[PDB]
Design a protein around this ligand. Structure first.
Ligand SMILES: CCCCCCCCCCCCCCCCCC(=O)OC[C@H](COP(=O)([O-])OCC(O)COP(=O)([O-])OC[C@@H](COC(=O)CCCCCCCCCCCCCCCCC)OC(=O)CCCCCCCCCCCCCCCCC)OC(=O)CCCCCCCCCCCCCCCCC
Ligand SMILES: CCCCCCCCCCCCCCCCCC(=O)OC[C@H](COP(=O)([O-])OCC(O)COP(=O)([O-])OC[C@@H](COC(=O)CCCCCCCCCCCCCCCCC)OC(=O)CCCCCCCCCCCCCCCCC)OC(=O)CCCCCCCCCCCCCCCCC
Ligand SMILES: Nc1ncnc2c1ncn2[C@@H]1O[C@H](COP(=O)(O)OP(=O)(O)CP(=O)(O)O)[C@@H](O)[C@H]1O
Ligand SMILES: [K+]
Ligand SMILES: [K+]
Ligand SMILES: [K+]
Ligand SMILES: [K+]
Ligand SMILES: [K+]
Ligand SMILES: [K+]
Ligand SMILES: [K+]
Ligand SMILES: [K+]
Ligand SMILES: [K+]
Ligand SMILES: [K+]
Lengths: 557, 190, 682, 27
C-alpha cells in the first residue's frame, strides 16, 4: 500500500511537471505581452471591436479594473440568482434564491471560493449553472492570473511605472489558456461519462421497483473549468464524489492534473520570464516538498483509519466511510490534499468523515494561506509574501539589505506584505470566534465534541482562504452563516489582492541590482529549506492553539 | 463614463463566450460524438429507464448484489440529494450505524465470513455509488447463489464480466457495476 | 576613543544607576514600543485580576496570578534594563569626551599677521571667521582652518592616540579640530563653525542623543514584529471562545501569560538596545556618524574608493632630488624650483623651499614682494606657477605643462621622459618645472605608504569589496604605489569631475559605493557616495561633506564600519529567528498546561514531562523573562561576524540561532520547572 | 454574553486597532 501510494504521488508529479512546462512557456509569452502564435490579427480585430486600446496602466488602474470587473460580475450573478425563475433553461420550476443564499453563492463564485451551502440539483437551474457560476468560474480564475501577471511584470520590469493592460490580460487568458483547455477537458469528461445536456430530470423505474429522479444538465462544461481554474463549485451536492461529475479514475487523475496545471505553469513562467529557471524550480521544490509530506501524512492517517471499525467486526480498519468505492483511500487522500492545498475546494470524499489527523492537514494547508501549490494566481502571489518574509529574514541574518531578484524590499512593501499575510489569519480567527459565541453559528454543528469546532474552523478557514471545501455536516444555509462566510470570502480575496497590487506598484519603480558575489542566492537547497521552514513555522505558530482544541483533541481523545 | 467602455465590452464579451458559446459548443460536440454518455448513460429495457450505469440503486432483495450504504436525504440512493454521512470517527452515532449494519449483514449472509468488508458497512461519499470492490462483491456470492439457485462459478464469471479495472492499479480500485450485474442476473434467470 | 576599547557592560557602577532608570520607563513611555506596550497592558491586566481575585472575584488562585503578574512586570523591567544599559553606556562614552573643553584661553586677533593683538576672549564668544593665534602648549579653542604657520598638534582628546600630527596652511592639513593641544611652535587659526554646530557637538548628537530616529531596517523589522504580535494576540484572544464551548474556558491570566510567551519579547526588548550598542561600538572604533542609516548602508558595499596622496599615503611627500639633464648645472637644479614655490603654501612647495635650498645654500631670494606675482594651485589646472617677470616659471606633472605651456611652439624634448620614468619607478610624485619654452627638469616627491595596510586590503578583498584607487597623479608612480599597497586596481589622472563620473557610473551599475577621501577636491565625491568616510587629518569641507568622519586616520576603516553595520543587522535577524523559534517550546509548555481541565487528553502533548499546569505556565513565563537578560550581552556585543560566503553565513547563523531557539527553550523550561519543584513553590 | 465578555472583546478590539495603527505608522 505504501508502494502504491509512492507510485501514485510519483507518477502524478511526473505527469504534472511534464504537462506544465509547455504551458509555462506559453504563459511566459502572455506575461511578456507577446501574442501567442496564430493569435495576432484576431487579437487586433477583437481589441478594436471591444475598444481595448492595449495601453499600459499603473497599479491603481490595474487594481481598479480588476475590482470593477469583479463587482460587475458580482452584481450580474446576484441578480441572476435572485431572478432565476424568470430566466429560460429551467426544466424544473425552482424558485428564486433567498437574499442570504444568493449573496453567499454570488460572493463565493466571484471570489474564486465556490462554497456551496445548498444542493445543486434541487437549488439552481441550467441557466443559473451555465450563464452564472461558470462565467464566474472563468472570470474569478482570470482575475487571479491577471494579478499574478502584474506581480511577475513588476518583478521583471526596471524603473517603469505601468504594469500592463488588465483587459488585454483577462481577454487573452480567458480566450486562450482557459477556454481551449477546458474544452478538451470537458470532452474527455463526456468521453468517460460526465453529463452534458439540457434534458429535463429523468424519471427512473428501478430494478427493485422504487423510483428515482436523475438530475441532468451541462455538468462537464462547468466541471472542466472548475478543475482548471481551481474553482471547486460542483454542479451537484457532491463535488467530485458524484459519478455524473467524476465518473472514472482516469477522469479523477485528469482532475488533479487540471487543478495543479496552471499553478505549476505560473511558477514555470515566473522562472522563464526572469531568465533564471532556478527561481521557478526553487518555488516548485518548496511547494512540492510540503505537498509530498502532507500527502504522505494524510494517506497514512486514512490507512490507519477508524480504530472502531475492526472492533465492531469489519474486515479492516481502513476508513472507507465518506469515500467512494471507485477510489482508494490513497487516491482520496491525495485528492483531499490537492484540493485543500490548491484552494480548489472540490471534494472527492467527505472530509468530515476523514480521520482527525487526516482532516487536520487540509485545515492547516488552507490556513497557511494556500501557498503550497495554491490557487490560480493566488497560490503564487500568496507564496511571494512568504518569499518576501524569507528574503527579509535571510538578508537581515546575513547582514545585507533584503532583496529578491535584485529589487530591494523596503518599508512600504514590508508594510504591504505584513498586511497581506495578516488579512486571512485575522479573518479565520475572528470568523471562528464569532461563530463559536453565537447560537446561530453553534446550531449548525453536527458532530459533537472537538469535531464540531473542527467543522466550524474548517468552514471559516475555507471561506477566508478562498477554498470553499466543506465538511458539509455544518448546515451553513442560515442567514448568519451565509453573511459571515460571504464577508470572509470578499475580504479574504480583495484584501490580499489590493496589497499585492500595491506591492507590484511599489516594485515597478525600482531597478534590479546586479547579482554581485556577496548577494544571497534565492535558489538552492538552503533557500528551499528556508522558505519551507518559514511557511511551516509562520502557519503553525498561528494555528497550533486553534487546531489543538479541534483535530488534535479528537485524535488524542 | 470615466473609461467604462472597455470594462463593459470585456465583461459582456467574456460572459457571452463563457456562457453561451463554450457550453453550447461543448454540448454540440458531446451530443454529436458521445450521446449515450452525454445523456446520462441510461440503461433502457424496452421503453423504460432502469437506471443510469453510473448512479446505482438501493437493492434490498435477497437475490440482488447489495452495495454500499447510502446516506442521501429521504430514501437511500436519492439522486436529488447526492450527499454522504458526514459522521466523524469520534461520533458514537457512526459506531451505532456501523454496528447495526454489521448485525444486519451477518444475519443476511450466514454462509459468508464473519469479517464483513468495510465497503458494505461504510457509507459512500455521494450516496450514489454503483461500485464495490470485487472482494466485497464475491463476499455475497454464497447468499446470491443460494437465493437464485446459481453456482459460484457462474457468479464469479458474471462478476468478472462486470468488473472494471483502471488503467494502472494505483490510481483507483477495481470496481463492480452493481446495477448492470443485477440486470444481468435478471436477464439470466428470466 | 581606542585608548580604552570599551567600557565594561557590568562595572557595578552604572548598573545600579541604570536600574533606577527602569522604573522611570515603567509609565507610558512604552507607547512607542508596541510589543512591550502589549506586555505592559497584560501585566497591568494580570495585576488587576490578582487584586480582584484576592478581594472578591469568582476564581480563587490569587497567588498564581500574582506570581504571573510579577514575572510579567519583571519582563518589562528587564527590557527597560537592556535599553537603559545601552543608553547609559552611550551617555558614559559621551561624557568621556564632553569634558575636553576644560579651559577657554583664546585671543582674537584684529589682523592676521602673527601678533599685534592679545585678548582674553572665552571660547564661547567665537563665531565663523574669527582669526585666533595660539602659542604652543595652549589648547585650540575652535574647529578652525589654519591660514598661517606650521605645527605638530596632539589630537589625543579626540582621537585617543599620543602620536602628534602636523598641521600647515592650506592644501591638506589646513583644518584642525578645537580642544586639542598644539605642541611645537605656534599656529594662526581662523574658526569656520558657529557655536553648537561643531564636530564635538556632532559626536554629542551622534552618541548621547536619546531622540534617535529609527533606521528603515529597524522600522521594517518592527513592522514584522507588529504583524507577529497581531497574529499571536488574535490566536490567543480567540482561545477563550474556542475553549468556552468545550467545558470550562481558560483563565484570562493563562491567556495573558501565553500571549506574552508567544509575542517576540526577546527581540522586542532588545531592538532598542541593538542600535544604541552599535553606535557605542562605532564610537569605540573611532568613526563619527551622522546617523545609523549610513552605518547600515555599509552592509551592501562591494566597491571602495580611496585616494593616493591623502588617504593611502601620509600626504607630506617631502623630498629633494635633482635634474641630470642638458644645460642644467648645480645652481640650475633649483634656481627655478624655489622661485616657483616661494608663495606656495602646499606641503610639497614648502618641502621644496626647505629642502632644495639647503642642498646648495640658495637663500639668495628674499620675500616675494620684490617684483613677483604668483598664481594659486588648483587641481583643475594642476599648476602652481608664478609670473615673476617677462618669462614665467610653472610647475606641473605630466599633462598640465603640455596642454598649457608646451603648445606655444617650444615642445619639451624626450630626454627628460626617461628621468621622469626612473623617478616614477621608485614611487615618487614627479613635478616638472619649466621656464617658458625651456624646461628645467623633474624633481621627485617620495611619499610614505601609511602603515601595513596590505593585510587590511587583503581582508577587504576577502569580504568581497573591490578596492580601486582614484588619483589625479602620474599613472606610473600611482601604479607603483598600488603595487606596493595591494589594491585591486587604480585610475590615475582623474579630475574631481572624473571622480564624480566614476562614482555615478558605479552607482548606475547597481552597486553601493564607498568613498574614503580627505582633500577639498573630494567633497563632491563624498557628497555623492552612499558610504562616505572622511579622514580626520583632512579638510573641513571633506569632513562636512562626508557621511562619516574617521578619527585615528586609518584608510581601511571600512573594515570596522562594515563589521559593525553588518553586526547590527545580523544581531537583529538572529534575535528575531530565536524569538520566533522559541514559540514552539512555549506552545509545548503552555498548551497542555492551559487545556488541562477543558480537554484532559491533551496531557499527551506534555513532552517535557512538566510537573503541573500552573508550574508549566510559570516556567514558560520565567524563561521568557530570563532570556532577555541572558541575551543582553549578545545585544550589546553583537554577533560574531565571520567574513564567509553569503550562503555559508546564512547556514552558520541558522545552525546556531534557529536551532538554538528551537532547542534551548526546552532545556530552559525543564530546568526552571525542576528548580521550582525542588524549591517546592509548585 | 455578559460584561466580562463585552469588555474583553472591546479591549481586544482596541489592542488590535492600536497594533494596526502602529503597523501603518513609523513611530
Ligand atoms: C521528503 C519527501 C520527498 C520530498 C521531495 C519531493 C520532490 C517532489 C518533486 C520536486 C521537484 C519539482 C521541481 C523540479 C521540477 C522542474 C522541472 C524540471 O526541469 O526538472 C529538472 C530537475 C532539476 O534538474 P536540472 O538539470 O537542474 O534542470 C534543467 C532542466 O531540466 C533543463 O531542461 P531539459 O532540456 O534538460 O529537459 C527538461 C525536461 C526533460 O524531459 C523531456 O524531455 C520532456 C519531453 C516530453 C515528452 C513526453 C512524452 C511522454 C513521456 C512521458 C510523459 C508522461 C506524461 C505524458 C502526458 C500524460 C500521458 C499519460 O523535463 C521536463 O519537461 C519535466 C521534468 C520531468 C519530471 C521531473 C519531476 C519529477 C518529480 C517526481 C517526484 C517523485 C518522487 C517524490 C514523490 C514521491 C515521494 C513520496 O530535475 C528533477 O527532475 C528533480 C526531481 C527529482 C525527483 C526528486 C528525487 C528525490 C525525491 C525522491 C523521494 C524521496 C522520498 C522517498 C519516500 C519513500 C517513502 C517513505
Ligand atoms: C530549525 C532548523 C534550523 C536550521 C538547522 C539546519 C541548518 C541548515 C543546514 C543543513 C545542514 C546541511 C545538511 C546536508 C548537507 C548537504 C546538503 C547541501 O547540498 O549543502 C547544504 C545546504 C546548502 O546548500 P548550498 O550551499 O546553497 O549549495 C549546495 C549545492 O547543491 C551545491 O552546488 P551545485 O549547484 O553545484 O549542486 C548541484 C546539485 C547536485 O549536487 C549535489 O547536491 C551533490 C551531488 C549529489 C546529487 C544528488 C542530489 C540531486 C538533487 C536532488 C535533491 C533531492 C532532495 C530531496 C528533498 C527531500 C529533503 C527533505 O545540487 C542540488 O541539489 C540543487 C537541487 C535544487 C534544490 C533541491 C531542493 C532540496 C529540497 C530541500 C528541502 C529541505 C526541507 C527541510 C524542511 C525545512 C526545515 C523546517 O544546506 C541545506 O541543506 C539546508 C536545508 C535545510 C534548511 C533549514 C531550514 C531552516 C528553517 C529555519 C526557520 C526559518 C526562519 C523562521 C522564522 C522566519 C520568520 C520570522
Ligand atoms: N605644489 C604643487 N604644485 C604643482 N603641482 C602639484 C603640487 N603638488 C602636487 N602637484 C601635482 O598636481 C596634482 C595634485 O595631486 P592630486 O590631485 O593627484 O592629489 P590626490 O588627488 O591624489 C589626493 P587630494 O585630491 O586629496 O589632494 C598631481 O598631479 C601632482 O603631481
Ligand atoms: K475555491
Ligand atoms: K465547494
Ligand atoms: K498565515
Ligand atoms: K483562490
Ligand atoms: K494567498
Ligand atoms: K493571506
Ligand atoms: K488571494
Ligand atoms: K501570519
Ligand atoms: K507575519
Ligand atoms: K519569545
Amino acid at each position: 500500500m505504501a508502494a502504491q501510494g509512492f507510485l501514485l504521488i510519483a507518477t502524478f508529479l511526473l505527469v504534472l511537471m511534464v504537462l506544465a512546462r509547455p504551458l509555462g512557456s506559453g504563459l511566459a509569452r502572455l506575461i511578456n505581452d507577446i501574442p501567442l502564435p496564430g493569435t495576432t490579427g484576431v487579437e487586433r480585430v477583437l481589441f478594436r471591436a471591444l475598444g481595448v486600446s492595449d495601453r499600459e496602466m499603473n497599479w491603481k488602474q490595474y487594481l481598479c479594473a480588476i475590482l470593477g470587473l469583479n463587482m460587475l460580475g458580482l452584481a450580474v450573478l446576484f441578480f441572476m440568482l435572485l431572478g432565476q425563475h424568470y430566466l429560460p433553461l429551467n426544466p424544473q420550476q425552482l424558485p428564486g434564491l433567498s437574499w442570504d443564499l444568493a449573496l453567499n453563492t454570488a460572493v463565493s463564485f466571484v471570489t474564486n471560493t465556490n462554497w456551496q451551502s445548498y444542493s445543486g440539483e434541487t437549488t439552481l437551474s441550467y441557466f443559473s449553472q451555465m450563464a452564472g457560476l461558470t462565467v464566474q468560474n472563468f472570470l474569478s480564475a482570470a482575475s487571479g492570473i491577471a494579478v499574478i501577471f502584474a506581480l511577475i511584470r513588476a518583478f521583471t520590469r526596471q524603473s517603469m511605472s505601468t504594469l500592463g493592460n488588465a483587459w488585454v490580460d483577462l481577454l487573452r487568458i480567458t480566450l486562450w489558456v482557459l477556454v481551449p483547455v477546458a474544452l478538451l477537458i470537458a470532452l474527455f469528461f463526456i468521453q468517460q461519462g460526465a453529463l452534458q445536456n439540457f434534458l429535463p430530470y429523468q424519471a427512473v423505474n428501478t430494478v427493485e421497483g422504487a423510483q428515482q429522479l436523475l438530475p441532468m444538465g451541462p455538468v462537464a462544461s462547468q466541471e472542466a473549468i472548475k478543475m482548471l481554474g481551481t474553482n471547486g463549485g460542483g454542479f451537484f451536492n457532491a463535488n467530485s464524489s458524484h459519478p455524473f461529475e467524476n465518473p472514472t479514475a482516469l477522469t479523477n487523475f485528469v482532475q488533479m492534473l487540471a487543478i495543479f496545471l496552471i499553478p505549476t505553469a505560473l511558477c514555470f513562467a515566473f522562472g522563464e520570464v526572469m531568465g533564471d529557471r532556478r527561481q521557478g524550480r526553487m518555488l516548485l521544490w518548496a511547494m512540492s516538498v510540503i505537498f509530498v509530506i502532507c500527502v504522505g501524512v494524510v494517506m497514512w492517517a486514512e490507512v490507519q483509519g477508524n480504530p472502531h471499525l475492526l472492533a465492531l467486526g469489519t474486515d479492516s480498519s481502513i476508513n472507507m466511510e465518506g469515500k467512494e468505492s471507485r477510489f482508494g483511500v490513497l487516491v482520496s487522500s491525495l485528492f483531499a490534499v490537492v484540493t485543500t492545498a490548491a484552494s480548489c475546494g472540490a471534494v472527492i470524499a467527505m472530509h468530515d468523515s476523514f480521520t482527525a489527523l487526516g482532516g487536520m492537514v487540509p485545515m492547516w494547508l488552507m490556513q497557511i494561506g494556500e501557498v503550497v501549490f495554491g490557487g490560480v494566481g493566488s497560490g503564487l502571489y500568496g507564496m511571494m509574501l512568504f518569499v518576501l518574509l524569507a528574503v527579509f529574514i535571510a538578508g537581515l541574518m546575513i547582514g545585507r539589505t533584503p532583496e529578491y531578484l535584485g529589487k530591494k524590499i523596503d518599508v512600504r512593501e514590508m508594510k504591504l506584505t505584513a498586511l497581506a499575510i495578516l488579512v486571512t489569519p485575522t479573518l479565520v480567527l475572528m470568523g471562528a470566534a464569532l461563530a463559536m459565541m453565537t447560537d446561530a453559528g453553534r446550531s449548525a454543528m453536527l458532530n459533537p465534541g472537538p469535531h464540531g469546532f473542527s467543522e466550524v474552523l474548517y468552514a471559516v478557514s475555507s471561506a477566508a482562504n478562498n477554498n470553499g471545501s466543506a465538511f458539509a455536516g455544518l448546515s451553513a444555509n442560515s442567514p448568519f452563516w451565509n453573511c459571515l462566510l460571504a464577508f470572509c470570502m470578499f475580504v479574504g480575496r480583495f484584501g490580499v489582492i489590493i496589497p499585492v497590487m500595491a506591492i507590484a506598484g511599489s516594485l515597478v519603480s525600482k531597478k534590479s541590482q546586479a547579482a554581485s558575489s556577496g548577494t544571497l542566492p534565492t535558489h538552492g537547497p538552503l533557500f528551499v529549506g528556508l522558505l519551507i521552514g518559514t511557511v511551516l513555522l509562520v502557519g503553525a505558530l498561528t494555528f497550533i492553539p486553534a487546531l489543538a482544541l479541534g483535530p488534535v483533541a479528537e485524535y488524542l481523545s | 463614463m470615466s473609461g467604462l467602455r472597455p470594462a463593459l465590452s470585456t465583461f459582456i464579451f467574456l460572459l457571452l463566450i463563457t456562457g453561451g458559446v463554450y457550453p453550447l459548443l461543448t454540448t454540440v460536440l458531446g451530443q454529436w460524438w458521445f450521446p449515450w454518455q452525454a445523456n446520462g448513460s441510461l440503461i433502457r429495457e424496452g421503453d423504460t429507464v432502469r437506471g443510469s450505469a453510473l448512479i446505482g440503486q438501493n437493492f434490498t432483495g435477497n437475490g440482488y448484489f447489495h452495495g454500499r450504504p447510502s446516506a442521501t436525504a429521504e430514501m437511500p440512493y436519492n439522486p436529488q440529494a447526492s450527499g454522504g454521512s458526514n459522521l466523524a470517527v469520534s461520533n458514537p452515532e457512526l459506531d451505532k450505524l456501523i454496528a447495526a449494519r454489521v448485525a444486519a449483514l451477518r444475519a443476511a449472509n450466514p454462509d459468508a465470513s464473519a469479517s464483513v468488508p468495510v465497503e458494505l458497512v461504510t457509507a459512500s461519499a455521494s450516496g450514489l455509488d454503483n461500485n464495490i470492490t470485487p472482494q466485497a462483491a464475491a463476499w455475497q456470492i454464497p447468499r446470491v447463489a443460494k437465493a437464485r439457485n446459481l453456482s459460484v462459478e457462474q457468479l464469479t464469471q458474471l462478476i468478472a464480466k462486470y468488473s472494471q479495472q483502471p488503467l494502472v492499479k494505483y490510481i483507483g480500485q477495481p470496481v463492480v457495476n452493481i446495477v448492470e450485474l443485477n440486470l444481468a442476473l435478471d436477464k439470466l434467470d428470466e | 576613543m581606542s585608548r580604552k576599547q570599551l567600557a565594561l557592560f557590568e562595572p557595578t557602577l552604572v548598573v545600579q544607576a541604570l536600574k533606577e532608570a527602569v522604573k522611570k520607563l515603567n509609565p507610558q513611555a512604552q507607547w512607542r514600543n508596541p510589543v512591550m506596550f502589549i506586555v505592559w497592558i497584560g501585566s497591568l491586566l494580570t495585576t488587576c485580576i490578582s487584586i480582584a481575585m484576592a478581594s472578591g472575584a469568582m476564581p480563587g488562585n490569587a497567588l498564581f496570578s500574582a506570581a504571573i503578574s510579577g514575572w510579567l512586570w519583571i519582563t518589562v523591567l528587564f527590557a527597560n534594563f537592556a535599553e537603559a544599559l545601552a543608553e547609559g553606556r552611550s551617555k558614559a562614552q559621551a561624557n568621556s569626551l564632553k569634558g575636553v573643553k576644560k579651559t577657554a584661553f583664546a585671543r582674537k586677533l584684529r589682523e592676521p599677521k602673527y601678533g599685534a593683538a592679545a585678548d582674553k576672549v572665552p571660547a564661547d564668544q567665537l563665531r565663523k571667521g574669527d582669526i585666533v593665534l595660539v602659542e604652543a602648549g595652549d589648547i585650540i579653542p575652535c574647529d578652525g582652518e589654519v591660514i598661517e604657520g606650521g605645527a605638530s598638534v596632539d589630537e589625543s582628546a579626540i582621537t585617543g592616540e599620543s602620536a602628534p600630527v602636523i598641521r600647515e596652511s592650506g592644501g591638506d592639513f589646513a583644518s584642525v579640530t578645537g580642544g586639542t593641544r598644539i605642541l611645537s611652535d605656534w599656529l594662526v587659526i581662523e574658526c569656520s563653525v558657529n557655536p553648537g554646530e561643531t564636530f564635538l557637538d556632532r559626536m554629542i548628537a551622534m552618541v548621547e542623543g536619546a531622540q534617535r530616529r529609527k533606521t528603515p531596517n529597524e522600522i521594517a523589522l518592527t513592522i514584522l514584529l507588529i504583524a507577529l504580535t497581531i497574529v499571536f494576540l488574535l490566536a490567543t484572544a480567540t482561545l477563550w471562545p474556542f475553549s468556552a464551548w468545550g467545558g470550562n474556558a481558560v483563565s484570562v491570566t493563562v491567556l495573558v501569560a501565553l500571549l506574552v510567551c508567544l509575542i517576540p519579547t526577546t527581540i522586542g526588548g532588545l531592538l532598542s538596545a541593538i542600535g544604541v550598542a552599535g553606535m557605542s561600538r562605532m564610537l569605540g572604533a573611532n568613526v563619527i556618524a551622522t546617523s545609523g542609516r549610513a552605518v547600515e548602508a555599509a552592509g551592501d558595499v562591494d566597491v571602495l574608493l580611496l585616494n593616493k596622496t591623502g588617504t593611502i599615503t601620509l600626504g607630506n611627500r617631502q623630498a629633494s632630488e635633482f635634474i641630470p639633464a642638458q644645460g642644467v648645472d648645480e645652481k640650475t637644479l633649483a634656481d627655478a624650483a624655489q622661485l616657483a614655490s616661494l608663495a606656495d603654501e602646499t606641503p610639497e612647495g614648502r618641502s621644496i623651499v626647505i629642502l632644495a635650498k639647503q642642498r646648495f645654500n640658495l637663500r639668495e631670494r628674499d620675500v616675494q614682494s620684490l617684483h613677483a606675482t604668483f598664481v594659486p594651485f588648483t587641481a583643475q589646472s594642476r599648476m602652481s606657477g608664478i609670473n615673476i617677470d617677462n618669462r614665467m616659471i610653472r610647475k606641473g606633472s605630466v599633462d598640465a605643462i603640455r596642454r598649457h605651456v608646451e603648445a606655444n611652439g617650444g615642445h619639451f624634448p624626450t630626454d627628460v621622459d626617461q628621468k621622469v620614468d626612473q623617478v616614477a619607478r621608485q614611487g615618487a610624485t614627479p613635478l616638472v618645472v619649466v621656464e617658458g619654452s625651456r624646461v628645467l627638469g623633474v624633481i621627485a616627491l617620495k611619499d610614505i605608504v601609511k602603515g601595513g595596510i596590505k593585510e587590511r586590503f587583503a581582508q577587504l578583498r576577502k569580504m568581497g569589496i573591490k578596492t580601486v584607487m582614484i588619483t589625479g597623479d602620474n599613472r606610473l608612480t600611482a601604479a607603483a604605489i598600488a603595487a606596493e599597497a595591494g589594491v585591486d586596481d587604480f585610475l590615475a589622472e582623474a579630475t574631481p569631475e572624473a571622480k564624480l563620473a566614476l562614482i555615478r557610473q558605479y552607482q548606475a551599475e547597481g552597486r553601493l559605493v564607498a568613498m574614503t577621501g580627505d582633500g577639498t577636491n573630494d567633497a563632491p565625491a563624498l557628497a555623492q557616495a552612499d558610504v562616505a568616510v572622511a579622514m580626520n587629518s583632512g579638510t573641513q569641507a571633506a569632513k562636512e561633506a562626508g557621511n562619516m568622519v574617521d578619527l585615528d586616520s586609518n584608510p581601511t576603516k571600512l573594515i570596522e564600519v562594515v563589521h559593525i553595520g553588518k553586526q547590527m543587522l545580523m544581531t537583529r535577524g538572529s534575535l528575531t529567528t530565536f524569538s520566533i523559534a522559541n514559540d514552539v517550546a512555549k506552545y509545548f509548555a503552555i498548551i497542555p498546561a492551559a487545556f488541562a481541565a477543558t480537554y484532559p487528553q491533551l496531557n499527551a502533548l506534555n513532552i517535557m514531562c512538566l510537573h503541573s499546569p500552573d508550574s508549566a505556565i510559570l516556567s514558560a513565563v520565567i524563561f521568557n523573562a530570563l532570556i532577555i537578560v541572558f541575551l543582553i550581552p549578545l545585544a550589546l556585543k553583537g554577533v560574531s561576524y565571520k567574513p564567509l560566503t553569503a550562503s555559508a553565513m546564512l547556514r552558520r547563523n541558522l545552525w546556531i540561532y534557529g536551532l538554538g531557539g528551537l532547542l534551548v527553550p526546552f532545556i530552559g523550561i525543564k530546568v526552571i520547572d525542576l528548580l521550582l519543584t525542588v524549591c517546592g513553590l509548585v | 454574553m455578559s460584561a466580562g465578555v463585552i469588555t474583553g472583546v472591546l479591549l481586544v478590539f482596541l489592542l488590535l486597532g492600536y497594533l494596526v495603527y502602529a503597523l501603518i505608522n513609523a513611530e
